[PDB]
Homo-oligomer: A and B are copies of this chain.
Amino acid sequence: RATSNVFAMFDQSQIQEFKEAFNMIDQNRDGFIDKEDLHDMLASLGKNPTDEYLDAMMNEAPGPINFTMFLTMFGEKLNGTDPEDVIRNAFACFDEEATGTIQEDYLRELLTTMGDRFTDEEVDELYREAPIDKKGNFNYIEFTRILKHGAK
């Protein structure tokens, strides 16, 4: 972690989207999530159950969270990530025929062998939720959606 000006982490469109998000997500629109504002949104969007255990995470950002604090807590977990287009362009270096897919074993080999290495457990933990074909094709195009716009 580092303490720079928060804008450096996010493109203007991305922080604008976070501003929109926070204006929706703050529920009693005092300018701050309190635990009721959170569980109200969680129940309103989600199903009937409510999980006060999530209060043990609201506390993580100290005090009632201002928009600069909301952005800080998202950005510090979000840092070390890159746009969808460059992730698709990165997969293109390995899918030499541009099939839109890599083999499950071949992507496991690619991830485990080189750079700063994944463990096979981390690869299987991707595969436990990533889209996959019983024939073996990892349709990475869909994975780039699931990694940013998805998660069901």
Q: Which residues of A are at the interface with B, using a C-beta cutoff of 8 A?
A: 1, 3-4, 7, 23, 27-32, 43-48, 66, 68
Contacts and interface: CB of A to CB of B under 8 A. Distances in A.
Contact of A7 (B7, B45, B68): B45
A29 B30 contact: yes
Main secondary structure of the interface of A (DSSP, over half): loop
A57 to B, nearest CB: 20
- How many copies the complex holds: the figure is 2
Nearest to A66: B29
17 contacts: A1-B48, A3-B44, A3-B45, A4-B44, A4-B45, A4-B46, A23-B31, A27-B66, A27-B68, A28-B66, A29-B30, A29-B31, A29-B32, A29-B66, A30-B30, A30-B31, A44-B68
